[PDB]
Design a protein around this ligand. Structure first.
Ligand SMILES: Nc1ncnc2c1ncn2[C@@H]1O[C@H](COP(=O)(O)OP(=O)(O)OC[C@H]2O[C@@H](O)[C@H](O)[C@@H]2O)[C@@H](O)[C@H]1O
Ligand SMILES: Nc1ncnc2c1ncn2[C@@H]1O[C@H](COP(=O)(O)OP(=O)(O)OC[C@H]2O[C@@H](O)[C@H](O)[C@@H]2O)[C@@H](O)[C@H]1O
Lengths: 154, 154
């Protein structure tokens, strides 16, 4: 079989796939205070809970993960960070009840920008003071990702 | 719908999935040379070319990405690195001709371990001096990953 025939014949639907997502932890100093950007979920799982602005790749427009994360942020948040840097990738069978799951987390520290929800998948968005966040119930493992992102600040 | 119900009715084949893989850049210092562990591929694409040891998740035995990468290395390489670090994640529509693709690349500097092939997706394994690697075509964007890990050393 040749390279070309293999690619013409290749079918990924022949194989079990995992969930693939991105997440962002955006930090700011606002009113002297360290704040993190959280959205309120209007989708299951963790419906009604606050967690990080994240989401699924849309091959219809996304060239890369960087585009995905920026687009999820503008959609759920209206916030566009000055840069975005990869923080860590968490991938296992327990973090997401929907199945085996991989999320690529990003982070930035930035100046305050007012936020507004711009897509139906969330019902609120707010910069929360960090201390309040650590004692909140947050979606999935978003408390860990935030904890990891805070260590990156230091 | 309740959360328990949402989870029970969840079906991923409602949605397009992306390719998800791991890769590892293992370095050693041996015979006064930085070397990187490569494998000679026996699957398309880039059949017959050298590349990193990597591959697809097996939900059957892998609880985590770390477990996936460790297994791929055992199968293709017989090497069991004494530790492993996440290097970065690359996800885009160009790097793998099979489709939109995310790889999670790991790395480690370790003392030498003899390597042998233990799975048929590979036909040779070798610890390559780094200057020789510059002289070969490597599979996908693997050279980029190697160079990234190599620069991280300093
Ligand atoms: N496997 C999937 N692939 C692509 N699209 C999907 C998938 N599952 C659901 N969708 C679509 O996305 C919508 C959910 O969008 P969001 O609410 O933005 O997704 P969310 O539930 O936030 O999932 C992403 C979150 O999962 C966590 O693993 C990760 O931490 C990330 O925050 C659904 O209504 C559906 O239309
Ligand atoms: N989408 C898929 N999902 C799961 N398994 C698959 C898929 N496509 C093929 N396979 C199975 O895995 C076999 C290929 O195994 P490997 O040779 O280990 O895969 P390889 O071609 O090296 O793919 C991994 C490589 O892709 C790159 O994007 C990435 O950098 C990584 O090194 C195939 O014959 C098939 O049985």
């Amino acid at each position: 079989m040749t390279e070309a025939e293999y690619l013409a014949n290749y079918d990924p639907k022949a194989f079990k796939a995992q969930l693939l997502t991105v997440d962002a932890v955006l930090f700011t100093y606002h009113d002297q205070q360290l704040k993190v950007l959280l959205v309120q979920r209007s989708n299951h799982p963790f419906l009604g809970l606050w967690g990080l602005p994240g989401g699924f790749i849309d091959e219809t427009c996304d060239e890369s993960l960087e585009q995905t994360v920026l687009r999820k942020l503008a959609e759920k948040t209206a916030v566009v960070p000055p840069y975005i840097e990869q923080l860590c990738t968490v991938g296992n069978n327990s973090r997401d009840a929907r199945g085996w799951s991989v999320t690529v987390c990003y982070t930035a520290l930035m100046s305050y920008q007012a936020c507004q929800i711009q897509i139906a998948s969330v019902s609120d968005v707010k910069w929360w003071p960090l201390a309040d966040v650590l004692q909140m119930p947050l979606a999935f493992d978003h408390l860990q990702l935030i904890e990891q992102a805070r260590e990156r600040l230091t």
